[PDB]
Symmetry: D3
């Protein structure tokens, strides 16, 4: 997990030419002000008119620099009816979330030694879920109304590996012949999938 | 921070005679079912008719055994108008929270090397805050309506050190002469304070 | 990363009814013998006549109990010509490997904040590679001969999330409608993919 | 706990304009000399003519830069007869100490899940005590002579949250109305307490 | 470093048939009493009439079970005039110590990338030293009186690798031919050294 | 163990005047190229015509900067017939290795609480071994042909404490009188040993 802090506060210095280190260098405390432990970036709903039908409003250290060194971060996800936060993975953290409105099918997948078990449940307002570090998971809006959830992570920068986008639209894309052997389908099927993720989202 | 997990899942075995270890032993996976990564315990508001005027609904590993080994936990706090979650400390975690309804004055205090600075702000619906590991902090409902927040921690068992209750109503209470030297007031003042925390809450 | 050790040795007790904890309980030192720090399980090549065209011979704590608490483990992967270790993820570790024979295209994919960059190179005998914790990666045999590599991990139980098998053949499988929204293709395409992973491998 | 070291030595560069990071940047090894692993700052007794009747001589990374990255630090506390190291907390470390001279009442308080138990004992020359990470604790000189102890921590910068001073004399002070609700006493009592900690110590 | 604690207290259960885990299982809190955070085992001087001319009084988790899970431990070392705590290593911790009486030559050795530098200084009453995790170090009494020091570690079980005893008197001893190649001397010299450590101390 | 990473990649900036921190600062991602996760430095055998009769080809972060922050590193050791990697220690990591060719006697020594037990075995092609963090260990070529092994570590910079060289040829050397008390032999024997390690290797 993220390294523990070695002082009370260390607000991230995000200017482009700052020296680079594991995580982020910090602003001098003299330049921090009173406001760094607070944020209002998750107050409004994100735009759900996207191919996935969901919008992620991030609140990691790049968006909330006061989280630097503190080992935590959050995000908000809004969903149009039938929208999905597609099968994805956080490489460096466990996720713990709460559904605020609507009805979401939440699915968590065990690794190979857990027999690739799929745990899935319809989670409603006020109900919570937990996603173990590095496991594949997804959310699907099964209600007729817009849904939204707010989650927390045990990292300032959990990272996100979107499975569909990484598999078919990385930069540059995984060679077709690699994907035909791995997916056990012909090249035409692989190219059809790639054509849907050519936009970069 | 909490030790990282060494397998996908390890639901806590909470029976009274289970062997004791750092954290908790786990139920055999065969006895876990499909439901351990989910909870509905924070769906309803807690009873705010208490001396503090707030109610904490806990969702640590004792209440949500599926969090065992995953490094995270949550809780919900409800506040009557003018109620407080009094100055307190979490010995083993950073807290990250969101106000869901109402208006809360949230205050975070730096340690001695930070000049004991008090950072405080009125946090409203959808706005977030972060409390660094082990620092004193509090919340006070400044609105005319009931307020509530949901927070996450970077520990399965953050712990809570309530300052007023620990100082004046521990078991057994800190001797009066220790408290008169520390608080710089006469014994009568110390005894008055102790009389308010004799109930254990 | 894995918790550090609190003593010299703690060989894993793998009997089925042993108490369950994070990681594994250990055999009494009196029952360990001289041989637990050694293994010969990776001496021979695995059977590459599988759908993927590769075979993984594991040497994690379940196969090498002397690794318990030491924070490390290994495995060997053998590849038939044109075979692949398909796009996969290790949820709890970084991997560091060496190609022993043959020619392998090794690809590592960055997360979303790294623009989903694909780093790929043909790695030959004696050459090494490193896969950051939790990122998607794969290997493909581009030579005309059988290839093999031996890798190490910074966990006693890294875990493996096989992307194709988890996406299309979990237990039970991810609903088709979830996968059609996520993959942006019709149900018939999703069902074709599922039919290839119905065997459990 | 503090991050582990990634090299033998990394003496802290404490100049005011050094770049800021978690912990401290280090002096080039060429500028370190032979003396950084040693100190004589705890050889003499501190001045106990203070309001608390005790004096803390710190030996954290700010006073002993050679501790940077090594995960440890110390301090010495001297006590006039009847003096106290008041109820306080270390946010980022466990403390382990030894009484060198005199008789000290040492008290350690459990958190809420430990029923706020007060463990207290008179500790004399050569006797030791341990304070778990983040718990409230104090020391009181019950002998007729000056007493002193030397303690170690499992952090280069444990931090110190003095309860009385933080509660009544932070900068700026916690509002009176917050403190009257939390302490369950009238404003006049709160103002009396605040008047004793207006000096900043 | 040692895993962080997941609760306030977890006194080690040291009975011989207790289940074995990383570190130690804990006594039920009901069986702990008030005394586990304290010890008087380092109050008296150890017997320095040994081949090394020094005596180590240990206060690790085997001798102080209340340290279990807290990440710290101590020990006391007493030295006859001209006695030594021979070149040794702690595999799992940094050491931080204070000389209480006498004059001790304290030497710390850097690793190969630090050019195997020897840092050494005569440390007197009240003066401190720090030994980075896993580096070779020693102490030698250069005064005419008995000397003693008390040290702390950042582990409940640091471990001790005595160089001379391990090299020449392990169980069973390292073969002579291995040692003649490594030490670049004839077999007769190696056998002479082995004869001095045949007693097991 | 090494601090976990807080981003995907952080290639070490090894220029001499780069700011110094725990571990290494990183190159801007814009200056990294595609090649940092790969290396060919262990493809060839090292020169075994040395006093020890073995050659270590290092692949730590100084030689493979792409390992920075990832918690892993490797090395290759080649051995002439009868050559040794002498009794040594890695202060900051566990080692896990595989013999690639030849026959090596591999010995691992327990600490004092493990009764200084010597575990030793002849390890051949494809067979593996594990060395717990900070314990003394060695390898000796018992075959008639050149032998070689490739090992991995759970640190980007494990460090190496060569016992013979550190004991008798540090800079500057440990005083003779310290070594005569510790080794229990006369000064002439100590000086003979020192004369063999005066070259610095
Ligand atoms: Mn997620
Ligand atoms: Mn709180
Ligand atoms: Mn892999
Ligand atoms: Mn203290
Ligand atoms: Mn020592
Ligand atoms: Mn080695």
């Amino acid at each position: 997990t993220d390294p523990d802090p070695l002082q009370d506060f260390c607000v991230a210095d995000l200017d482009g030419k700052a020296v680079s280190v594991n995580g982020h260098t910090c602003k001098p405390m003299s330049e921090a002000g009173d406001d760094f432990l607070f944020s209002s970036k998750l107050t409004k709903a994100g735009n759900t008119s996207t191919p996935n039908g969901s919008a992620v409003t991030e609140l990691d250290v790049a968006e909330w620099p006061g989280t630097n060194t503190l080992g935590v971060s959050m995000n908000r996800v809004d969903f149009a009816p039938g929208g999905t936060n597609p099968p994805h993975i956080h490489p460096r953290a466990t996720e713990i979330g709460m559904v605020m409105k609507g009805e979401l099918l939440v699915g968590i997948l065990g690794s190979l030694d857990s027999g690739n078990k799929l745990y899935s449940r319809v989670v409603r307002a006020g109900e919570t879920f937990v996603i173990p570090r590095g496991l594949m998971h997804f959310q699907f809006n099964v209600g007729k109304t817009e849904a939204y959830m707010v989650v927390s992570f045990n990292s300032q920068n959990p990272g996100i590996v979107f499975v569909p986008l990484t598999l078919f639209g990385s930069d540059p894309p995984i060679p077709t012949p690699v994907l035909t052997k791995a997916l056990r389908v012909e090249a035409g099927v692989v190219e059809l999938l790639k054509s849907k993720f050519a936009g970069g989202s």
